[PDB]
Design a protein around this nucleic acid. Structure first.
Lengths: 293, 174, 79, 141, 108, 62, 42, 190, 203
RNA sequence: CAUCGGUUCUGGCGGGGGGAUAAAGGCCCAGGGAAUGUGGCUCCUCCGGGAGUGUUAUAGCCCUGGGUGUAAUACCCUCGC
RNA sequence: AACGCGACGAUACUACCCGCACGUUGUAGACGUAUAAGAAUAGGCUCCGGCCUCGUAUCCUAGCAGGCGAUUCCUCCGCCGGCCUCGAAGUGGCCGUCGGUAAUUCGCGUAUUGCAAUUUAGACACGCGCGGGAUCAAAUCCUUUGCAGACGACUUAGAUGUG
């Protein structure tokens, strides 16, 4: 028969499957929509989470109860060493979707970004991009000019390749993180000129974001391993000394079909999921050279 | 009801000692063949007189051919048909070239418009409208109009069904 | 009704064999019961059938009335 | 009140219009039965173009651009033949492009193997001069 | 040099066996002849010899090519499809394969 | 209550975007674009002018 | 101009005519003769 | 029944140019030029007489015959629009709060815009964007009146209906609250 | 009837079911078919009926797991046509599978099919099949309303393709005019006996 | 492959008979009649065409009887190649 | 999508590339496996004269499965190179060299495969070959890490260093 007392579902079906993320570095699923009348700008960056701290903020929120008063708020610190742009990727529109057409790299690549292409960097001959560095020299970069003008002529979406300087962080990892950051604003020729003017140059965080701006943070959450239904989904615990487990779901099914449904709470992997959180306010962009930041 | 022909069927009761010369009864019957013509004769004669097939004989069956099949004529058909309600009269008219063609068109039209079969339609009278003012239904009053000239818009060309693919898109103007 | 954007459960026209057999049996029993009620019916039924008549739209209805006239006159004269 | 309207102009089925049947013969319309059937008679001296008097469905007929002027409605075979030889329907039909296409089709299907070989050789001989003329035209302009 | 062809056969396609809705008879096969679309055209090709040419794996007696021979017996339907009987029934994998309809034995 | 997917709330948000937050985000955009613009600024076959060919399938192989 | 009023207020609407698609299929005098014949017949 | 031939006629004044090409009617006169695509209706156009447009349907049903009256009235309305024009006078009345109506011309879109404020004391500003070709004027002769003028009857009447339907009283007795904007008069400009 | 290497059909103005039946019969007979411009295929009846039918299709789904075994509702017009074709082919047999590998369907006219002759089927053409006055819809509009994301991209690509085809057809008109002038000029140099023999033979 | 036998499928050709000795229809002869009235005449006119008149004229049609005629053809039956 | 796809880096080895050298190597099935406007269908095309049911069309089509030698022609085709051009799954145009080439006509050879027996001939892919050109690479086990974790898996680090 029907359920006697109505209750909402435990968990959301919008975040299935609850599996581990396919990659450690977060993926930008969607970029902001491009307006060609806007000036050219970068749309994303990477950093490393340092930790959290406490602030006291003088609130200016008209109509609030804490207006013209002091509030204590929790904030997160993200260390952001400057990013080095070493590439330019072109995208075209097809009736199957966006397709990458070509990729132009810089002449000199650091060992940090060269470590990304290797799983055993210590045993390697470190031969990456060595033959590619010679096409900047042969025929005065005719192939480089050809690919850049191919991007200018055929592509609609332009993204730079930027890698983090992980040696300025206290991390023991020496392998840098490389990602595509989409140039928004201007025409495609302006985007390509912008990217080639940005090859081999460090880009700081204050030239991409500004204080008081709300941004999005994309990452992979804290992993918890194999976790049962009580903590994985928030189901109600069974009474004390219930036979065969009390941190369980009593009925995984009592009705047709003769199956277990995908909407039933089951034990499995909890945490280490890829998440995109929106509307996070930047409170301070502090500079490394400042001794009183 | 098929390729129909009109038959003069004359029949009579069998002569007895009381009546040496029985009366002859003649009907005009639209039937596909002579067997159906004689069957319909005996059916209609059982409906009117004390004659049946076991007590009567078929004196004559003659095909009545149309006098002028090359002359376009207007025909008025007065008929009765059976529905779930009962018997109903209809008078209809058909512009054809022969009485048998008019009757075949009537059978097809009654089947299409009122779902009446051959078993439930009685043909009472078929006449030729000799003058134009005898035409009463508007769909043939529009055909007997003076200087009737009309085009044929949107004529799909006759393309062979075995030729699957064509190289140009057909036109519907010829 | 919001039928185009959200259709409901379709109504199956695929007949069930059990349903068809039951419907055929019920139809046969209804025909039998109607035969019994027709045999036991006391409502009056005229032996003669009302003539539907001749349509007014027939153009030679005058002429038909004439040969009816000399037909009945000849029958009365012969009788 | 000047009005510029361009529209389609169908040929019209009427008394005097000449139909070309599926077998290639010709007929003239003398009476319209309904919107799908007509009465037509083809009283032509040429047996290929001749047609007996009778009912012609409009689905198996094609409207030719020849209209017999002042053909009386319901005229019998003698009157239609007199109008046919007076107006000269056969010569006008021979002048029309439909009969030229039909004659070309018959000439192509009446060919033997030697005929097709000679068609090939003569077409190549004509093609040589055509190619020379085309090369001269393309070189000049 | 001559830049012509060397074809003396009419192309055809092996459609299916002689069959009902469920029961198939592999002894008689159905062939669609190119350019034939009615019984009047199929009557010309009645009695002609039709060959199915396929490639085997091993080279036997100088070739890796095997031929199944048969003859066209009667027309099928109203669309120029013909029935043929072969020495051995045609492979069921060859539904849609190409067959050669010869011009012999000829009555021209 | 009016939902997030409500036409009136969408129209109010569109008016807010067009009239209020728009100029602020715009001015932030020219400031950031100028700042990173500062960092950015600070034969045909043999020259690449003509884009030539680089150095399953859509069609049936034949 | 139009000397009358229209109930809906669409003053630009033309003086429409009766929707009679069977117009012109018969004449008035012939109809009068047929009326006399049907009266005698009935 | 299928009627073999059915015809309608449209008289055309001297100052009107009518061009029909693949059932696309273009009517130009002293006030302006209008276009309308009537390709969704099977109809044959012809020049029966000088200054007379003939509409004909062949072998059509009663519905197909009846559609010619709609086509006739549409083309006649286009002719009346390009000759005399169309004018809708609207009056806006109020009980306590004076309704404020502002009219401006958005030049980038090339169209007029009407802003309505203080409708029963509401702080929202209602905005109506006109269809192109419809000109809005606050009447100086009478009190609290808009005038909508144009060549397209459909555009002018639809703009008037939008102005009526944007000012609707909600959750109140309509016998008591009579506030709103109403179409007072419909007619021709000339 | 003729056997081609591959037949390219233009989907514009065609009826979905009739074209699908004809394509399925030719695929089972052994013919390779490429159908282009599936977004321009026509479905008889007014558009709300087709929208209601596709929504009733979308309603059906496997309850216990929607990632396996369920009806996977493809929103592209080419895949709608492909579903219509696959419903008329025994796709669960090896013969039906091999027949289905002989079919290619696309939105628009991707290269190199832009430079190939696109044939039409008169038995499925909307203008030749439907009675005037009846309503019809287009598969591309239905796909755009049920979730297809690339209507505008296909539109821009088709505009570019048609501009290039317009330039090609200007060149074709120039070539045809030059060929006619060449034949007119060479008519005065060819042997009159050859010309009369060709005229008598019909060429 | 040829010549055959048995069974069978299919195509073409030459005849005969029957009906209202098909019905039509063509070409003539003798009557009668009408309009979806031809020519002519009259009246309107945008002169593009309509309206009226009457029985063939500078088109024709229908009805009845006769000759060619035991005409042809369709349909049915049948004898063969 | 673990049997959907794209761009890019380095590619030891017979591995990669080029040429011809062939397959008891494989293919739902070569035999001229020839042909790009778009758009409307109660309207279109054009060379601007006219044309439109019709792809029953157009191109190509002869020669030992197609030779040799002339007479003769400047027509057609193909490989390379240059310059442009083609991104929807990327390929065509012009020019130049070279090679072949009945549009006309003729001579020498065809036989004997014996009265038919697939006309073993195309394309793609794969392998074995040689003869040349090009390049000297990674992954995993192991140790370690704890941003991870039942175990696998994952984030790291391990070759001189900011280890």
């Amino acid at each position: 028969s029907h359920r006697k007392y109505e209750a909402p579902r435990h968990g959301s079906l919008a975040f299935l499957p609850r599996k581990r993320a396919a990659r450690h570095r977060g993926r930008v699923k969607s970029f902001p929509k491009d307006d060609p009348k806007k000036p050219v700008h970068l749309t994303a960056a990477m950093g490393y989470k340092a930790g959290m701290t406490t602030i006291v903020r003088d609130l200016d929120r008209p109509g609030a109860k804490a207006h013209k008063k002091e509030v204590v708020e929790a904030v997160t610190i993200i260390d952001c060493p400057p990013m080095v742009v070493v590439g330019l990727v072109g995208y075209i529109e097809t009736p199957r979707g966006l397709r990458s057409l070509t990729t132009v790299w810089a002449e000199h690549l650091s060992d940090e970004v060269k470590r990304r292409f290797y799983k055993n960097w210590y045993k390697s001959k470190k031969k990456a991009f060595t033959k590619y560095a010679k096409k900047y020299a042969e025929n005065n970069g005719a192939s480089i000019t050809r690919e850049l003008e191919r991007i200018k002529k055929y592509c609609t979406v332009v993204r730079v390749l930027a890698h983090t300087q992980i040696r300025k962080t206290p991390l023991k990892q020496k392998k840098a993180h490389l990602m595509e950051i989409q140039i928004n604003g201007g025409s495609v020729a302006d985007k390509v000129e912008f990217g080639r003017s940005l090859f081999e140059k460090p880009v700081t965080i204050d030239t991409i974001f500004e204080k008081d701006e709300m941004i999005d943070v994309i990452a992979v959450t804290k992993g918890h391993g194999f976790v049962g239904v009580t903590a994985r989904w928030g189901t109600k615990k069974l009474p004390r000394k219930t036979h065969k487990g009390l941190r369980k779901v009593a009925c995984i099914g009592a009705w047709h079909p003769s199956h277990v449904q995908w909407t039933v709470a089951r034990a499995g992997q909890m945490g280490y999921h890829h998440r995109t959180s929106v509307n996070h306010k930047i409170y301070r962009i502090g500079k490394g050279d400042d001794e009183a930041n | 009801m098929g390729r129909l022909q009109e038959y003069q069927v004359i029949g009579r009761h069998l002569p007895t000692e009381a009546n040496p010369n029985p009366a002859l009864y003649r009907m005009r019957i639209f039937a596909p063949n002579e067997v159906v013509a004689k069957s319909r004769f005996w059916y209609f004669l059982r409906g009117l007189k004390k004659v049946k097939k076991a007590t009567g004989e078929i004196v004559s069956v003659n095909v009545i051919s149309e006098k002028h099949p090359l002359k376009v004529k207007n025909f008025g058909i007065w008929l009765r048909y059976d529905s779930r309600s009962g018997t109903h009269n209809m008078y209809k008219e058909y512009r054809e070239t022969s009485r048998v063609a008019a009757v075949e068109a009537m059978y097809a039209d009654m089947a299409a418009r009122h779902r009446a079969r051959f078993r439930s339609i009685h043909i009472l009278k078929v006449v030729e409208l000799e003058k134009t003012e005898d035409v009463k239904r508007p769909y043939i009053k529009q055909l007997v109009a003076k200087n009737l000239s009309f085009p044929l818009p949107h004529r799909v060309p006759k393309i062979s069904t075995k030729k699957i693919f064509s190289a140009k898109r057909p036109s519907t103007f010829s | 009704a919001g039928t185009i954007n959200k259709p409901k459960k379709p109504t199956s026209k695929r007949k069930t064999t059990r349903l068809r057999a039951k419907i055929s049996k019920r139809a046969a029993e209804k025909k039998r019961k109607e035969r019994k009620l027709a045999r036991k019916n006391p409502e009056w039924r005229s032996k003669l059938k009302k003539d539907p008549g001749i349509p007014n739209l027939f153009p030679y209805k005058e002429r038909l009335l004439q040969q009816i006239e000399e037909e009945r006159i000849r029958r009365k004269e012969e009788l | 009140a000047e009005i510029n309207v361009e529209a389609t102009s169908w040929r019209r089925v009427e008394v005097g219009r000449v139909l070309k049947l599926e077998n290639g013969s010709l007929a003239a319309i003398v009476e319209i039965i309904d919107h799908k059937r007509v009465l037509a008679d083809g009283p032509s001296s040429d047996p290929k173009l001749a047609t007996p008097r009778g009912i012609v469905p409009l689905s198996r007929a094609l409207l030719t651009p020849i209209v017999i002027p002042k053909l009386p409605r319901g005229a019998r075979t003698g009157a239609v033949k007199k109008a046919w030889e007076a107006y000269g329907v056969d010569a006008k039909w021979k002048e029309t492009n439909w009969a030229k296409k039909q004659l070309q089709q018959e000439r192509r299907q009446s060919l033997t193997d030697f005929d097709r070989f000679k068609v090939m050789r003569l077409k190549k001989q004509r093609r040589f001069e055509e190619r020379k003329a085309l090369a001269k035209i393309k070189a000049a302009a | 040099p001559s830049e012509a062809g060397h074809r003396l056969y009419v192309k055809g396609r092996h459609l299916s066996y002689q069959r009902g809705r469920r029961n198939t008879h592999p002894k008689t096969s159905l062939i669609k002849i190119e350019g034939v679309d009615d019984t009047a055209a199929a009557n010309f090709y009645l009695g002609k010899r039709v060959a199915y040419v396929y490639r085997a794996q091993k080279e036997v007696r100088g070739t890796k090519i095997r031929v199944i021979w048969g003859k066209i017996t009667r027309p099928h339907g109203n669309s120029g499809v013909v029935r043929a009987k072969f020495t051995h029934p045609l492979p069921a994998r060859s539904f849609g394969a190409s067959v050669r309809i010869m011009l012999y034995p000829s009555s021209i | 209550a009016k939902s997030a997917r409500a036409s009136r709330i969408k129209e109010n948000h569109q008016r807010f975007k067009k009239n209020i937050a728009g100029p602020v985000e715009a001015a932030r955009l020219e400031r950031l674009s100028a700042k990173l613009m500062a960092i950015a600024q600070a034969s045909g076959v043999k020259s690449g002018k003509s884009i030539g060919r680089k150095d399953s399938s859509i069609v049936f192989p034949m | 101009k139009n000397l009358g009023m229209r109930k809906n207020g669409q003053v630009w609407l033309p003086a429409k005519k009766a929707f009679r698609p069977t117009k012109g299929l018969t004449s008035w005098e012939l109809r009068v003769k047929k009326r006399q014949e049907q009266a005698a017949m009935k | 029944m299928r009627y073999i031939h059915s015809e309608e006629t449209i008289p055309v004044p001297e100052n009107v140019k009518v061009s029909i090409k693949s059932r696309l009617v273009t009517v130009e006169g002293p006030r302006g030029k209008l276009q309308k695509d009537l390709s969704h209706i099977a109809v044959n156009f012809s020049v029966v007489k000088k200054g007379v447009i003939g509409l004909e349907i062949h072998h059509g049903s009663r519905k197909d015959v009846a559609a010619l009256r709609t086509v006739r009235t549409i083309i006649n309305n286009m002719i009346i629009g390009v000759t005399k024009g169309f004018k809708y006078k609207m009056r806006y009345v109020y009980a306590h709060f004076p309704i404020n109506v502002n009219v401006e011309k958005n030049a980038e879109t090339g169209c007029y815009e009407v802003e309505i404020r203080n409708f029963i004391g509401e702080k929202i500003v209602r905005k109506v964007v006109m269809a192109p070709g419809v000109e809005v004027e606050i009447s100086k002769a009478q009190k609290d009146e808009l005038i909508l003028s144009g060549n397209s009857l459909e555009a002018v009447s639809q703009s008037a209906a939008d102005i009526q339907q944007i000012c609707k009283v909600r959750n109140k007795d309509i016998r008591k609250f009579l506030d709103g904007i109403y179409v007072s008069e419909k007619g021709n400009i000339v | 009837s003729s056997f081609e290497s591959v037949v390219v059909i233009d989907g514009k103005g065609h009826l979905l079911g009739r074209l699908a039946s004809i394509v399925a019969k030719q695929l089972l007979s052994g013919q390779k078919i490429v159908v282009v411009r599936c977004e321009a295929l026509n479905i008889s009846g007014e558009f709300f009926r087709a929208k209601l039918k596709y929504h009733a299709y979308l309603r059906k789904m496997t309850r216990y797991n929607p990632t396996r075994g369920g009806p996977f509702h493809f929103r592209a017009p080419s895949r709608i046509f492909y579903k219509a074709v696959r419903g008329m082919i025994p796709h669960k047999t090896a013969r039906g599978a091999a027949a289905l590998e002989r079919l290619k369907v696309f939105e628009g006219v991707p290269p190199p099919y832009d430079k190939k002759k696109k044939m039409v089927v008169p038995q499925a053409l909307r203008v030749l099949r439907l009675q005037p006055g009846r309503k019809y819809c287009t598969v591309g509009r239905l796909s755009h309303e049920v979730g297809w994301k690339y209507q505008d991209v296909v539109a821009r690509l088709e505009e570019r393709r048609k501009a290039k085809g317009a330039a090609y057809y200007e060149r074709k008109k120039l070539a045809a005019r030059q060929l006619s002038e060449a034949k007119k000029a060479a008519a005065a140099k060819v042997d009159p006996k050859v010309s009369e023999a060709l005229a008598a033979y019909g060429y």
